Design a protein around this ligand. Sequence first.
Ligand code: MN
Ligand code: MN
Length: 224
Amino acid sequence: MAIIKREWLEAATDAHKKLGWKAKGAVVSAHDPSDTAKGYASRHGSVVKRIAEGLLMDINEGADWATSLAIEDGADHYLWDGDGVGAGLRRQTTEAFSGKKITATMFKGSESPFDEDAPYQRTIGDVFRNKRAQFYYALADRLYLTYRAVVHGEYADPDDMLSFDKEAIGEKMLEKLFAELTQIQRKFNNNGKLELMTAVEMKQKLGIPSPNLADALMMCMHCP
Ligand SMILES: [Mn+2]
Ligand SMILES: [Mn+2]
């Protein structure tokens, strides 16, 4: 039921070095303010460069922490989870980015998918229940393609892959991320759409704590 294989994550570690390409594109950062530990993720194009945990912070301290990291990382775009306790953080977030060319986007995972009437590559809306499922599968698809390139020698466009810059991220935090990603699970859906267990469900059913590093990385798959 899990959507991401550990072997893909191991392959994707330093995949850009293994395959000889460089990060190109926008810098995208995202923040998970927790249900009520926090998460932050940042990538430059297809290369993930920071995974950070935000400990012993209230909601406003967490947002200061995450927005400061976004500034430090040279973000072009910043997203944060607004489905729960984060729903009120827009003012603080825009204040943090005053005078800086950084866009701020509230991510709501429970929304219908982005661009849902577009064809699925029938429509995106037929395939994914919501944005949480859509962007976790964007992540899973990038990782699988990266695995096939790294381990099976199957060409893929770097723009469609994802590499973890291990030296930038740090081994400990990369391991924490990976331990969360392999816990993200599909759940039954009565309309035949892809849908994932929520944190609440993961906690109650399986005793799994909130995967906020994973969620932060998932949100940064959406470049607004
Ligand atoms: Mn969240
Ligand atoms: Mn979360």
